[PDB]
Amino acid sequence: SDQEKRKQISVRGLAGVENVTELKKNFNRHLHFTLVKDRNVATPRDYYFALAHTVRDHLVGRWIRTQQHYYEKDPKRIYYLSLEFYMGRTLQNTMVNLALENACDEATYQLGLDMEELEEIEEDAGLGNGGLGRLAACFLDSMATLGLAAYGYGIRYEFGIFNQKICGGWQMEEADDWLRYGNPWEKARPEFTLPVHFYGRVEHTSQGAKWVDTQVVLAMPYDTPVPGYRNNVVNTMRLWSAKAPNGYIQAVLDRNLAENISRVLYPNDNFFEGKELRLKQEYFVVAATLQDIIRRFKSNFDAFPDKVAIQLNDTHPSLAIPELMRVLVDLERLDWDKAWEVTVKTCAYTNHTVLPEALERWPVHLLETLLPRHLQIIYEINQRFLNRVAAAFPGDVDRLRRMSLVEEGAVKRINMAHLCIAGSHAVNGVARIHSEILKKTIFKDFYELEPHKFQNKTNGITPRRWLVLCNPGLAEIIAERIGEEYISDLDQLRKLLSYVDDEAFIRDVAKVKQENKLKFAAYLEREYKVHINPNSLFDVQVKRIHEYKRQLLNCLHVITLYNRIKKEPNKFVVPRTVMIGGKAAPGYHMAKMIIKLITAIGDVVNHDPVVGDRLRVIFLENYRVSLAEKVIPAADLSEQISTAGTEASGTGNMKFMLNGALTIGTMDGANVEMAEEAGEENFFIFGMRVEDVDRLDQRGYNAQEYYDRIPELRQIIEQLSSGFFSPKQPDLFKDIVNMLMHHDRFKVFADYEEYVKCQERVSALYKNPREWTRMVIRNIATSGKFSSDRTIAQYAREIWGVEPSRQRLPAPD
Amino acid sequence: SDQEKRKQISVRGLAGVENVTELKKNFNRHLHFTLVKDRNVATPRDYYFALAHTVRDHLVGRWIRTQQHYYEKDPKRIYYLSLEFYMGRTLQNTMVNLALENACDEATYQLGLDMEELEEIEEDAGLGNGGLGRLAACFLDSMATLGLAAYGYGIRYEFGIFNQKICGGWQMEEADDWLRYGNPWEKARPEFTLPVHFYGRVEHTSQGAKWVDTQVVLAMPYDTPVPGYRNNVVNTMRLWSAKAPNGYIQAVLDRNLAENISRVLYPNDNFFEGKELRLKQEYFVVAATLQDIIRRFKSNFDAFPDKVAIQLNDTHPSLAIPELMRVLVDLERLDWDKAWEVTVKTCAYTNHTVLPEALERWPVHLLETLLPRHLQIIYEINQRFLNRVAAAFPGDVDRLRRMSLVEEGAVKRINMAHLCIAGSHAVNGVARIHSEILKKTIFKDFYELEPHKFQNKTNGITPRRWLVLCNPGLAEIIAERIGEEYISDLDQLRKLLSYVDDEAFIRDVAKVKQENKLKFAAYLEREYKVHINPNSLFDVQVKRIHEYKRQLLNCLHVITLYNRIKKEPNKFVVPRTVMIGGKAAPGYHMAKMIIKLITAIGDVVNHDPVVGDRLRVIFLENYRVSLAEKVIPAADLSEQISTAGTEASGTGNMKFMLNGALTIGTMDGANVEMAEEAGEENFFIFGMRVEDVDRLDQRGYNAQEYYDRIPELRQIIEQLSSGFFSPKQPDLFKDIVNMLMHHDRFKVFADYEEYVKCQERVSALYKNPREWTRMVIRNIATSGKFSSDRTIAQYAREIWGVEPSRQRLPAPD
Ligand SMILES: *Cc1c(COP(=O)(O)O)cnc(C)c1O
Ligand SMILES: *Cc1c(COP(=O)(O)O)cnc(C)c1O
Ligand SMILES: OC[C@H]1O[C@H](O)[C@H](O)[C@@H](O)[C@@H]1O
Numbered sequence A, B: 001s002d003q004e005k006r007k008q009i010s011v012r013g014l015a016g017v018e019n020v021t022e023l024k025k026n027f028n029r030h031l032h033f034t035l036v037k038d039r040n041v042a043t044p045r046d047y048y049f050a051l052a053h054t055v056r057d058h059l060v061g062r063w064i065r066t067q068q069h070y071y072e073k074d075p076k077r078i079y080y081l082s083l084e085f086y087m088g089r090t091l092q093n094t095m096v097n098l099a100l101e102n103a104c105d106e107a108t109y110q111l112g113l114d115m116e117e118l119e120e121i122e123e124d125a126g127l128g129n130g131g132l133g134r135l136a137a138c139f140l141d142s143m144a145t146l147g148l149a150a151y152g153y154g155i156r157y158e159f160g161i162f163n164q165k166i167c168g169g170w171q172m173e174e175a176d177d178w179l180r181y182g183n184p185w186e187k188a189r190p191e192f193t194l195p196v197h198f199y200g201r202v203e204h205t206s207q208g209a210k211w212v213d214t215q216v217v218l219a220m221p222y223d224t225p226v227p228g229y230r231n232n233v234v235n236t237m238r239l240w241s242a243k244a245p246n247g248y249i250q251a252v253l254d255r256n257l258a259e260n261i262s263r264v265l266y267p268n269d270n271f272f273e274g275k276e277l278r279l280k281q282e283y284f285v286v287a288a289t290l291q292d293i294i295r296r297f298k299s300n301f302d303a304f305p306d307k308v309a310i311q312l313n314d315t316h317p318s319l320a321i322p323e324l325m326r327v328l329v330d331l332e333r334l335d336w337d338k339a340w341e342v343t344v345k346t347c348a349y350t351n352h353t354v355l356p357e358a359l360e361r362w363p364v365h366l367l368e369t370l371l372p373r374h375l376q377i378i379y380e381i382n383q384r385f386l387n388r389v390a391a392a393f394p395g396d397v398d399r400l401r402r403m404s405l406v407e408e409g410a411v412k413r414i415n416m417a418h419l420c421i422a423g424s425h426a427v428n429g430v431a432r433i434h435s436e437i438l439k440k441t442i443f444k445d446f447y448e449l450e451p452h453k454f455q456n457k458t459n460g461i462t463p464r465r466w467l468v469l470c471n472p473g474l475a476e477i478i479a480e481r482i483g484e485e486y487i488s489d490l491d492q493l494r495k496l497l498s499y500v501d502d503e504a505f506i507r508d509v510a511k512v513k514q515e516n517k518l519k520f521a522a523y524l525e526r527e528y529k530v531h532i533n534p535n536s537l538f539d540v541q542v543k544r545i546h547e548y549k550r551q552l553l554n555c556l557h558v559i560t561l562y563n564r565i566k567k568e569p570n571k572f573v574v575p576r577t578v579m580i581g582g583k584a585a586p587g588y589h590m591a592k593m594i595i596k597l598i599t600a601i602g603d604v605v606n607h608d609p610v611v612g613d614r615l616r617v618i619f620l621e622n623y624r625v626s627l628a629e630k631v632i633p634a635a636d637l638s639e640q641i642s643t644a645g646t647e648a649s650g651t652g653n654m655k656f657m658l659n660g661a662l663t664i665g666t667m668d669g670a671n672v673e674m675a676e677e678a679g680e681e682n683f684f685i686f687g688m689r690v691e692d693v694d695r696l697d698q699r700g701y702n703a704q705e706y707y708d709r710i711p712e713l714r715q716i717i718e719q720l721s722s723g724f725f726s727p728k729q730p731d732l733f734k735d736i737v738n739m740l741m742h743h744d745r746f747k748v749f750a751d752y753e754e755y756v757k758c759q760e761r762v763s764a765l766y767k768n769p770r771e772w773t774r775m776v777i778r779n780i781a782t783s784g785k786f787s788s789d790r791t792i793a794q795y796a797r798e799i800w801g802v803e804p805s806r807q808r809l810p811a812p813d
């Protein structure tokens, strides 16, 4: 008896076989017992929640079984540490990966509800800035689909990336209260809360170093399930929330100081701000995470790297290296060398940018008072690492200065990237050209010392959210010719090359794109009361606003199109709707000026009667993952025009390719590989190559030369300076003009002519619908390489030492 | 079709008929799908939660049906506004009121679990200080049991009353993180969030006054169900939580300033601290609550008082009077007189104390900057009210000064009590002697102007939590002679007088008390490693520490008992375990010194070998509702010794009476009525009566007179002064001695002799178990009047204008 009785406590049978009668029963149960509502007062939001809780049950049954499986099998575990996870919406993705969509649609329909209406109630979970955070999300999806025992570890920010409002043509920021109505997917785990220490000092007793007199902040984990595609594997994303440890009133009010650590996501994309609060955030996630990892490993350390892999997403969680050493040496009392060998074999670092202003260099004064023991450990790591450099390159003192983890100057700093290379067994770039640039520029010295460490892992996007979910029309016409295997084996899209001359397929691809454009236009009119002509080429550039991404170059082209129509009003031109969207970091003055310029150009272009519906410029407000899922499937032309050598990889580019848009871009990041897969003849590559940018830097970039030699460019700069785009405040864009003319690090003028000419060729091909569509088919069919399943498979085999698998686990019952 | 399909969405059938097989099924469901756990990792806490969620389902089904019933019947609604609701534990109370206890016990037993272990996992919801907050909780229970459409309205504090730790014999405060693990009973209602305004200014436009330029704080409601006893009626307690309205980082961090309004309960019991944060809390609950009330009434105002009753628990929510006037006049644009007539007919005020330092008088400077429009309205109310006084008492200018809502001085203040009397149709005291003291002392002037307003509503406690729940042994031996009708008709206990000479009943009452003492001793040893001799008289004084409650008088008696044993070591004395417990407000120096004195006396008494087990003094740490439910059923003697005229009513006194303890106390508060019900011959009344205290005040209280005339008292004061109870710090209690000797507002010395003598008589009767028990039966049998069902029935018929009912609603299915 006794404990044997508890055997009845099983997940044995759950909310159903996955069909209509039971879905309806559970939906009714949740509407009343979970939400405490009834049909008389229920709102569409209430019904959305009832459907979400219903679907969550099926997810939870699999989640429990997956974790029970991992405990029994005891596979090597992969921990993906990131300060960002841009997850987006969850309801549809869950229904799709669990094959519940059809039944839920019928169940809601029979109850007198419309599921598509419900689905649109859900808003993004935006705990990320853009590319890096969304890559982490795509990776989570892929690791689950590939059966890896992976855990995503980050911070549960109370407020994710701000909501962007456009007022008077300018960006205004609004806090993203994403949890107001709650989050039905996450599960609070207060019982697993852990302490994280700050400040204090180090004392050296007889048996080692001791970090004492610290202030404590508790880390409370919240777990979110992440489902693999139809394999019944559900992995976990664990995010930490800061809590205060446990006169009088003020002491209780002051608990907010500790809880501020997880209050808001720093809104910087590709830019380092050395704020102490940000440093606390980084150590917070690292300390709680590693405790969790070691605890889980325990329920000696020679086998740790055989059971644990820690992947560092950028240098954000780099403190994991000195923290793991601290724990092993100070707490587990292992000798230094043994601990270091363990640390290096466990950690791997992924770099995401080559721009100096984006890399982390923390002032040592900040590190000595907030984390004294870590700074001590960092200096010791440096000394031993430099000893190795000196032995490998005797007498090369300059190299010692260059490779040091410590940067000298008035403000002493720790170069976190060097710390990561020294403490990781693998370091990777995110696109072939980027990983190569790494090996011969910023990390050349390190590659020369340890060549074996340097790898490449070209980025990817998940075909579930970025094709099956966001573009059902495209997914179905594709499935009708090659089946559904491609969904978890994207290289099968290659089979579509056999239909490049098939009249029905050409017909279908174009009909789908058009249906998408029609629907997107309906979306814009509905929620923003913005009209766009669907029988125009949808020219889209959506990504964070940056000088390096060159939205300004796009701007020059749009003004070029406008001026050309005014010059010859009665000459035909392929009608276009140029859409530019993206958020600017709150303190990035130029990026905000750029947003104002885009809206100001629209104010002129969209209201000039001679232009009419031949050209329209729209700034897409609040670009985020849910908007990307909408606009990308409706795009004809994808703008990927960063200065060659600046965009490490890009991923938006891959989304557009997979969804039927042709690409105009530079030979930068992954564009290079996309062009290689599709064939340059099916791409619109233009401008300076990395070699060309470098030669210009060698001789000196003089924008005045281009200005003096290109009349059409001069006309535009004169209009800007003139106040033609800001009549009421003539000098409004003076900062943009001066930067372009005298301080342009990204050489906009140098690529202007080739850009305008390439755009002419784009228009030329669009004039011929049949050939445009045929080229589109050639892009879609060769986008297979950019599935994040491919990327993750490589990380697993070449870095983590684990074998990917499409073995499915049995359904719960 | 269409909307007709939604008819399937019904509470129709729920988690079961209320029996074992289905309880087990749902418990299993919640353990896995709600908690995301399994039997391998589940902890007792996890299982407690699974049982709580299981029981919650049954509660929710009734909650939905009750609210649907109220909408259809449209009864007059009662709103009980309080800044405190001391709810305590919910699981058992819920099982008892829904008659689910037996089945849940069997269901858990069959699953290999022990329900009593699970139940003890739950901790109190302590959003109250003591008597006033617990009265509100007892009232909620009774209103639901009496079928009234009642709603309790308050604030959802993040931290309730602090947890008291005793360190080195002193009280230390620890924040009560009551929500750490969550609260399964409440339901967040973000969709019903409302705005509350602060600061700003008033401008007088052409059509009225306008409150502009305010700062907004949002009020988000959380609803908790409160079940009536077996009538399937489930009412609501709605508590508001503060949220901020919707460079950049600091602006987001600063949202905490607004959310601080609902962060912590001010820990003052019977004492006014005019802190601005407290004023914000009061207006916060009032503004959100009244909006809610008017909204609910709308889905003209002449009928408002026929549909609405607003009861003000103390002056805490007094701003409801000027706020309702503001809304009616400024927003609904009604004329002043009509609005005032509506306001007075809607509001009623309950006073809870006569001590001057406990009453609210807000500085007008504070009110003019935080709530300018309310201060304007308050001055207008005052002017019109004083005009009425002047007409009723021509030429009595002193009366005008005395009754004014405005108190003059260096610091101008608004007397909130006067505001309440002026704006309410009923004003009540909480015990006969208190309501009479009100009529002839602090509110004499108002009673003379409007005698019809003044009422009495003697307090009560609910027999569900305070008998059936906390003392199952007593409840069953009672049920075996008179059935269970008494549970919701306590006057039936009167039937037990027929068993005062019944040998089996006498036997049973004493066996139950003894079982209770044995179990309480087991509890103390288990969790505090404190031994107490169960074959000793349990002398208990549990309530907040206060000079007016005279724990110090108790202290004098204990030292008297100790000195007497030392004087005649070999003389027999009835063995006693004197227990004193209760929290002191954090800033109340004397109360904290008193706690230290209690522990210091114990340090001497409990370790003196001559005394041994004949006398033991214990300070019960962290007295709270859950401890009261434990210690009260084990008490033999109830200490209710406040100076006559200071304790408005008391309720702990009623708890002890209902649970089998005899009472030693003054003729104060409800003690008077308890003595009247049981007969003074069955009580231990002693000391000065109100008349005696007053005569002493007239001539001047000189404590030295008593000191000079009572040798045993002098001995004690000498020991205190001496350092006999603090050898290492001889003058530690100098402040207590000086206050007693020279500044004792509560005349401890004046009641010492009669107190000691009365205690001798208590011991005399305890020596005779049969007669002690017979007197106990006479107390229990006459405690019926103190059921809060009686109290609420009176509020309903004499103030609210609604008829109580024991009609049961059908079970959900
Ligand atoms: C894919 C994605 C990105 C990354 O876009 P890039 O053009 O590679 O910088 C940024 N934001 C969102 C919302 C995304 O979906
Ligand atoms: C009943 C109760 C009170 C009120 O006690 P009095 O002696 O009337 O002041 C205070 N605290 C708790 C925890 C209670 O249960
Ligand atoms: O690696 C994921 C992404 O990280 C950063 O956002 C880089 O700017 C981008 O090029 C890269 O694609």
Ligand SMILES: OC[C@H]1O[C@H](O)[C@H](O)[C@@H](O)[C@@H]1O
Pocket: B130, B131, B132, B135, B270, B352, B353, B430, B459, B647, B648, B649, B650, B651, B669
């Ligand atoms: O009215 C409920 C209670 O309120 C206050 O705590 C009074 O001190 C007390 O005497 C009264 O019983």
